[PDB]
Amino acid sequence: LALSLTADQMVSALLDAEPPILYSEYDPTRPFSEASMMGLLTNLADRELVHMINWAKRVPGFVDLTLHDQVHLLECAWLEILMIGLVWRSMEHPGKLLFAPNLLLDRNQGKCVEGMVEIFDMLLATSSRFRMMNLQGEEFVCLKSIILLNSGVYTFKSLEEKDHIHRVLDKITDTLIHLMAKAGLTLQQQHQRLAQLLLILSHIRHMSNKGMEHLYSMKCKNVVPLSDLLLEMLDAHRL
Amino acid sequence: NSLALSLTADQMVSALLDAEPPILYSEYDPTRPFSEASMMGLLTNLADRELVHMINWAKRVPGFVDLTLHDQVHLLECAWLEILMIGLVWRSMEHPGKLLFAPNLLLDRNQGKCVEGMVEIFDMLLATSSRFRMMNLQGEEFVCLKSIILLNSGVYTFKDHIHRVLDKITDTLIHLMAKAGLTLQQQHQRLAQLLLILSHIRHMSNKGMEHLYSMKCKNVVPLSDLLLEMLDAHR
Amino acid sequence: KILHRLLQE
Amino acid sequence: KILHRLLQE
Ligand SMILES: CC(C)(c1ccc(O)cc1)c1ccc(O)cc1
C-alpha cells in the first residue's frame, strides 16, 4: 500500500493525518512559577503524545512494522516530532514559540525554568531557518514523517524490517522532489533545497537530545509533574 | 567574496581529498588489552592527536578560513566529535563488526564493555559503519559529508556565506553521483539517504559527549587541556 | 507499557 | 583558549 502511493497521494495522506493544535491551561492573570510553567508545557506535551501516537498509525508504512518496532521508532523520535511541530506553528511569530494558540512565549519567560532558555533559543533559531526558507506545509509533513521513520532505524530477518523503512523513506524523498518541481524549482535548486531541508533534521535531533537531558533534570528535581506516559518515553532514552 | 564559491565540482573534490588528515597510530603496547583506564587512555590520547590534525584540516576546507576566527571556533567546537566519529566509521567500513580507531587498534563490541557506558556508543558506531558499507559509500562522498558536518552543525546556533558553501558542497555530491552513472531518481534518493545518516551521527556525538563528560567526572584518566576545552564547550 | 497499549488500542 | 591559538598557528 504505502509503496504504491503516488507523490500526490502521499502528500494528501500526510496532510489528512495531521494532528490538531491543542490548547494549554494557561491563565494570563495567574502568576507563573517554575513548577507551574513547566507543568503547563509538560501537561500539553502529554496530551500531544496521545495524538502523535495515533497520527503515526496513519503515516504510510508505519503499521506494516511490528509493534516492537513502532514502539521503538516513537520512543526515539517523540521529542523531535513535538519540537518540529512547535517550530512549524511558531513560523509566523518571530521571537515567539507558539506552544498553543493561547500560549505564546519568548526567551524571557523561558527562564522561570532553569536551563530552558538554551533550548528555546535553538527552537527560535530553527523557526528563523524555516522562515528564511519559506518552508511549505507540504514539506513540513514530509519532514515530520521522515523523522518518525529515520530517527530510530539504526538503533534497533529483523533486518527485513529496516529494509522496508528505507523504501518508505525513499518514497518521501521522491515526494519532496515532486513538490519542489511543481513549485518550479530548477533541478539544481531542487537538490539544494532537499539538502537544506534534511540538514535541519540534524539540528532537530540535537535539540531533542539537549531537551531530553533537560527533562531528566526536571524529573530528578522532582518539582514539576511528569505524566506516566512522559516518564516512560523519557525512560526509553535512559540517561 | 570567498574563493570557495568560484571553484568547480572537480576542484572542490580535489581540495577536500587533498586536505584529508593522516591516519594516526595508537601507542604500540601489544599486551595492554585491556582495562577501563588503559582503554580510555589510548582513545583520549588518540583523540587529542586527531584534534590537532582536524583543526588544520578545517582550515583547508574551502570557505572556512573566510569566516571570522570566532565563527571558526564555534563551528569546530560544535562539530568536533561528529567529525572524529564519521572518520572512525569511514575507516571501520571495510572491517565489519570492528572499529578501526587506529591501524594498530582495531576494537570490537566485547572490548567496548571494558569501559562503562561505551558499549552503547560502540553499537551505534558499528551500525553506522555497516550502513555506510551497504551503501557503498565512496571516499569522494565521505569528504563532502565530513565538511558538511563542519559547516552545518553549528550554523543555526549563531550565515549566508556558510549556506552558499553548503549549497556548493551539495552540488558537488550530486556531481559525483551523476559522474558515477546514477539516474536522477537515484541521485536525489542517495543524497537524502546520506544526509539522513548525519542525523544519527549527531545523535552519537551527543551521547558520546555525555559519556566523555562522565568519564571526566570519574576522574579515571586525565584529559588534555585541549580535549577538555572541546568538551567544556558543550556545557 | 503505556505507549505499547495506545499503539494497540 | 587553545583552539584559538591552534586555528591561527
Ligand atoms: C517536552 C516539552 C514540555 C514540550 C512540550 C510541548 C511541545 O510542543 C514541545 C516540547 C518541553 C521540553 C523541554 C523544553 O525545554 C521545553 C518544552
Ligand SMILES: CC(C)(c1ccc(O)cc1)c1ccc(O)cc1
Ligand atoms: C573521544 C573518543 C576518545 C574518540 C577518540 C577517537 C575517535 O576516532 C573517536 C572517538 C571517544 C569518546 C567517547 C566514546 O564513547 C568513545 C570514544
